[PDB]
């Protein structure tokens, strides 16, 4: 599955996941292209900020959906 995710200075990336892959996977996808570590990274979909723990099929995540990257400092 397909996804975008996407930074407010306007750069996507093409992230392929599956229903049942964690957020936390997605992160470490992002982590793979990008080198943010999961921890720096804070997902939203739909106006919502995306639990590590829970997976794409909970937020219902298809191809094409977007989800939106943020930096979160700790
Ligand atoms: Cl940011």
Do not use: F, W
């Amino acid at each position: 599955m397909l996804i975008k995710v996407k930074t407010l200075t306007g750069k996507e990336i093409e992230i392929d996941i599956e229903p049942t892959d964690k957020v936390e996977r997605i992160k470490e996808r992002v982590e793979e292209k990008e080198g943010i570590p999961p921890q720096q990274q804070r997902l939203i979909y739909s106006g919502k900020q995306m639990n590590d723990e829970k997976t794409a099929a909970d937020y219902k995540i298809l191809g094409g959906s977007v989800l939106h990257l943020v930096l979160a400092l700790r």
